[PDB]
Amino acid sequence: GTFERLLDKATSQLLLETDWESILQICDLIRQGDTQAKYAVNSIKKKVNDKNPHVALYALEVMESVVKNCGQTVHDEVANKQTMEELKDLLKRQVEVNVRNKILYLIQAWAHAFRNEPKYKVVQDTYQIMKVEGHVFPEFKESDAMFAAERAPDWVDAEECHRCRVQFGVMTRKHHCRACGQIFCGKCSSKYSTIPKFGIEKEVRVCEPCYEQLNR
Ligand SMILES: [Zn+2]
Ligand SMILES: [Zn+2]
Q: In the chain, N or C: fewer CB atoms in 10 Å?
């Protein structure tokens, strides 16, 4: 029950300012895998759509933080067509300027944050649409779009290659994919890539599926 208690606490109409303690605990729960991102983001979205603009604004601040801090598992839940449509709709019916302004702030911030990720293009597409419709965005600060690097996965040991199942031995050395942490023979891990999301800016060994996910 902790995620839910905290979300309630963070979006209380009693608050005079952002409850950073509760927000950062919510971020930690998602990063640690204690709370699933889809459920978390769905729960926050329910609050974003509240008729009370204080609740909606506080919920948008929770959304801002989970996106900034929680990595791809959360980005997958916001940088999609369903969410962009819901925010376009919300922005169109919202009569409260601070909620409106925050939606614009976030769309702009995310569109810049996601500029290297083709799977997330719908956010930049939505930004451009909104500008054509006449929305005046707040001035952009680089700081808005600077997200926390994610933690690279721990490496797995095993007796055989994760892909081809060859047995490791003297003539078949163990290697690891830096992107997923699984264990491979050399034949199955002969690709090299940067991994920006983990702050890896040198080309490091990856498996073939990770290589293709990374080099779209
Ligand atoms: Zn192999
Ligand atoms: Zn991999």
A: N
Q: How far apart are CA 130 and CA 98, in angstroms?
A: 17
Tell me, in angstroms, the distance from the centre of ligand 1 to residue 171's CA.
13
- Residue 169 is given by DSSP the state B
194 alpha carbon to ligand 1 midpoint, in Å? 21
Distance 33 CA to ligand 2 centre (A): 19
Decide if 195 contacts 180 (C-beta within 8 A).
Answer: no
Give the method used: X-ray
Handedness of CA 207, 208, 213, 216 (dihedral sign): positive
Annotated ligand binding at 180? The verdict is yes
Residue ranges of domains in the chain, CATH in brackets: 1-149 (1.25.40.90), 150-216 (3.30.40.10)
The secondary structure element, H or E, covering residue 59 is helix 53-70
DSSP-assigned beta bridge partners for residue 205 = 192
